Design a protein around this ligand. Structure first.
Ligand SMILES: [Fe+3]
Ligand SMILES: [Fe+3]
Ligand SMILES: [Fe+3]
Ligand SMILES: [Fe+3]
Ligand SMILES: [Fe+3]
Ligand SMILES: [Fe+3]
Lengths: 170, 170, 170, 170, 170, 170
């Protein structure tokens, strides 16, 4: 029952998209966890909460665009369990930004590996789709989070973290 | 490290909220699956796709409001794996609406059991929170989906399903 | 042929809603009678006429919302005769307001008994529906009519009743 | 205590108006029944529901205009029981439209008999009142419902009934 | 001289409302004290001053709504002395927020005890009134003040307290 | 710890302001009592209710301006119990206006005694503050209430009191 759409779309690329979908949803869930961690009364950093809630929404949007792409190419979406996040509590604002940077680098490596799979099969359209809609945003997200980390080291604990939280809330 | 917020909030109610969060996220994931199933080129029902994408977004919003409520009361959000949906393909529009009705009844029973836990501990605020923000919407959602099922039986397969899809897309 | 909607909805609650529907329609009919009584040429109190016509319309709206609720829960609307009002003529403005207070207290007692039936079966949603959409309005209506009665005793017969009629017409 | 208004108003005409009031209220109640029948989850025809709810409201308005007319002429409104509708369930859309046509013809015959009573007593004003505000609308209502019946026979059961329901909802 | 309004309103519930009125007025007075404490020239924290003045106004509004409710149900408002606040000076911003949290928890416990009295007498309307207009706001107020306390511990004394004062003034 | 603000501010004037604060709050409480007395279902005079609620709010505003003035001058606000009002019920509209006149004259005498204390210590600014913001308003309030009393004697009991209530509600 090969899809009437399918053309130049390798089954390895199709499986890679399904793998990437689960990875994006995993990142979504971790950011959702962080968002409500910073909403705890004994944490109470609403700027960090908003930053990670927005990051969560953006990851969900990335996953759904991959689901849409899967269908466009005639592939078939196959979902797996979304594994719960690595921690239940995420420390300081700086701690969570550090985790976010490693998470974004993990998603980026996964996308770079997916791009290699697509290129190996001369899937020129899928390569450009990944470059345009995924790879550029990862480079921007990693730079932005790195800037946040550097600034959070500069301002220090206590009042410094409070002031940076105001910046994220603004 | 009992939260400075906590008052009249039983640990059984707190665990019940965490259980309900995972249930809402599970329903979210199933609706997300259906949404992109109806986006398949060999299904191609964009009205059903939109209906289930919106249902998915609403379930996500319900889960996040429970996470917010957990924090308001001084409880602690503890997330578990989001289990993948029961199926990979969802049949006809009528088939998927039937599954949706059973899913909504499952979430509703779970909320009714949660309300009993809250009432047992005379958690009057949590009872009203659940009634106002969860129980009324479940009654409306179940009626709406039941209406859809009846109409989909009336219009039948083929052109009938196409016409009802237009109604959901409108 | 149990409705596909039905969940946590006891047949005693379903019969109680049908009983309440007939009670609301009965109150509607009595207020309609009063409205056109005060439109008689030998009564000629257009403010009282308008007050009771509006009360009649509100009772009709309450009955229809119960019919809608019956359907939402999967119950089945069963209508009975609407008994004609207790009188054909309603006396003075004060007389009719006194009858209205007893009528509203009768409807309120009936709703309070219905709420007990719902609570007995742990129908948490139906309890909140009745509290939100019926019980609060009864408390307000009873206070408002009691205020009217006190004022009508203050102003007395003749010119006093005329002046209060202007207030209701305003 | 003959009303100071009364002139050229026969007691037979006055009783006939009271009879007609009860007939209009009866039709109101039957249409109200149909409206909430089509709101059942196992019927789920919101266009038919709206059509009969509007018909119900129009019958109520006709009854109240007769009550107003009774008072204008110096007659006295005397209300009777409103008998419950002939059925609890009304079948298909076509079935209910058929019942509506017979109901409207029954009300029309009753008004035609009332017009004869008025004319017999040379009540020229009451004849014109009935012609202008009741008889013309009955002819229009009967034609409109007959058109609906013919169209519902044309479109047939299933998808046809669904499409006509959309027309009534529009 | 039982009020013509009174229905399903127990004298224990009526006394409980009068007790709650005095409690709300007491909280009002304490917040008023704090507001003008932070207006002292040797304290000079106008953001904290505004926060507690607004809290004072909200407590006054809660008390007046209970007085209004007492009258709605046919109970009789009986006022007692408003006891002066526990202190004349309230320390640091953090100190006063700590006192506010304990004050709000005291009012909340009192309302929860009042809700139990109402429920014991199956006063369904009064239960919902308390849940809707009092209990939800207490949960929100306690969370908000707890967030303030956590943030004030984070920012520390001196410049930190000044910066948080700006936040409350904003 | 004499305030850095303090200049030409005698401790007798400072104690007098604290005494006046408690007097204004006492008047506030009495007017609040009257406001909800006229909201009783067996009193039901909403114009009088509004008049005394507004008078209550104005007394509260006067007290807070004295608290603000205390701080401006470097004095220290010291609050005492607010004694409950002299009565629980306030009779007729005329009765309550009579009590209001005596209350306003009591507050006025207290302010006149405070002005003497200030003048004795050549506190020229405090004298002008009291004249501008307190003494003129007392003369206006006493005249206005006296006019109300005279009018309420003119219109008499029953319909007259009702008509004057409309004037206060306007
Ligand atoms: Fe992503
Ligand atoms: Fe949900
Ligand atoms: Fe009603
Ligand atoms: Fe008619
Ligand atoms: Fe309060
Ligand atoms: Fe004053």
């Amino acid at each position: 029952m090969e899809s009437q759409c399918r053309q130049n779309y390798h089954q390895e690329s199709e499986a890679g998209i399904n793998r990437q979908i689960n990875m994006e949803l995993y990142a979504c869930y971790t950011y959702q966890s962080m968002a409500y961690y910073f909403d705890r009364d004994d944490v109470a950093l609403p700027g960090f909460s908003k930053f990670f809630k927005n990051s969560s929404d953006e990851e969900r949007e990335h996953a759904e665009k991959l689901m849409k792409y899967q269908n466009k190419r005639g592939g078939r979406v196959v979902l797996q369990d979304i594994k719960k996040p690595d921690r239940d509590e995420w420390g300081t604002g700086l701690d969570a930004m550090q985790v976010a940077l490693q998470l974004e680098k993990t998603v980026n490596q996964s996308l770079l590996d997916l791009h290699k799979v697509a290129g190996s099969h001369q899937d020129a359209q899928m390569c450009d789709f990944l470059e345009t809609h995924y790879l550029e945003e990862q480079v921007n997200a990693i730079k932005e989070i790195s800037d946040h980390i550097t600034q959070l080291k500069r301002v220090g604990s206590g009042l410094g973290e409070y002031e940076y939280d105001r910046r994220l809330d603004s």
